[PDB]
Design an enzyme around this catalytic site. Structure first.
Site, PDB file in Angstrom:
ATOM      1  CD  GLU A   6      17.106 -13.510 -30.867  1.00  0.00           C
ATOM      2  OE1 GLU A   6      16.339 -13.352 -31.819  1.00  0.00           O
ATOM      3  OE2 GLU A   6      16.673 -13.582 -29.659  1.00  0.00           O
ATOM      4  CG  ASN A  49       8.776  -8.075 -33.891  1.00  0.00           C
ATOM      5  OD1 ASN A  49       8.965  -9.285 -33.842  1.00  0.00           O
ATOM      6  ND2 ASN A  49       9.689  -7.195 -33.661  1.00  0.00           N
ATOM      7  CB  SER A  58       8.913  -3.037 -33.195  1.00  0.00           C
ATOM      8  OG  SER A  58       8.733  -4.383 -32.793  1.00  0.00           O
ATOM      9  CG  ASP A  62      13.029  -8.262 -33.656  1.00  0.00           C
ATOM     10  OD1 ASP A  62      12.751  -7.362 -32.873  1.00  0.00           O
ATOM     11  OD2 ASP A  62      12.392  -9.321 -33.801  1.00  0.00           O
ATOM     12  CG  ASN A  83      11.824  -4.627 -30.916  1.00  0.00           C
ATOM     13  OD1 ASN A  83      11.264  -5.312 -31.767  1.00  0.00           O
ATOM     14  ND2 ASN A  83      11.238  -3.699 -30.206  1.00  0.00           N
TER      15      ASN A  83
END
Ligand SMILES: [Cl-]
Ligand SMILES: [Cl-]
Ligand SMILES: [Cl-]
Ligand SMILES: [Cl-]
Ligand SMILES: [Cl-]
Ligand SMILES: [Cl-]
Ligand SMILES: [Cl-]
Ligand code: NA
Length: 129
Positions: free
Chosen positions: A35, A46, A50, A52, A59
């Site tokens: 990640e 994204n 949104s 992360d 998120n």
């Protein structure tokens, strides 16, 4: 902060993630590797708008408030900025909520695609824990 592999394994164990919802510490270290590359300041935008945040790329659609994700929730009750701290407490407490949501660690697509069913105990090998 960029954690070392064993440094992060230790911090996650210190905060009770090891075997949380039946997921061994190597599963959590592996998820963080793919990640964030162990970087607490990691961010990813994204297509849906949104974002992360942090070592486990949590998120804004459900889990934290950033003020720029229309219609979203904040189920961890934190500013998304808290997920970028050198202190992983906020990320770990929020991850415990996420992994309890019903799909276990499949909530992290990178865990499903790169860690699930692999020899994840390699991620804690060598570490004084
Ligand atoms: Cl590594
Ligand atoms: Cl493990
Ligand atoms: Cl928002
Ligand atoms: Cl909410
Ligand atoms: Cl907030
Ligand atoms: Cl920490
Ligand atoms: Cl599960
Ligand atoms: Na949100």
């Amino acid at each position: 902060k960029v954690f070392g592999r064993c440094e992060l394994a230790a911090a996650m164990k210190r905060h009770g993630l090891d075997n949380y919802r039946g997921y061994s510490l190597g599963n959590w270290v592996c998820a963080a590797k793919f990640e964030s590359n162990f970087n607490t300041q990691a961010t990813n935008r994204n297509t849906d708008g949104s974002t992360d945040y942090g070592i486990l790329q949590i998120n804004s659609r459900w889990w934290c408030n950033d003020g720029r994700t229309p219609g979203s929730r904040n189920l961890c009750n934190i500013p998304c900025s808290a997920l970028l701290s050198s202190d992983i407490t906020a990320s770990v407490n929020c991850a415990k909520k996420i992994v309890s949501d019903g799909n276990g660690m499949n909530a992290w697509v990178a865990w499903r695609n790169r860690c699930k069913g692999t020899d994840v105990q390699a991620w804690i090998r060598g570490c004084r824990l």
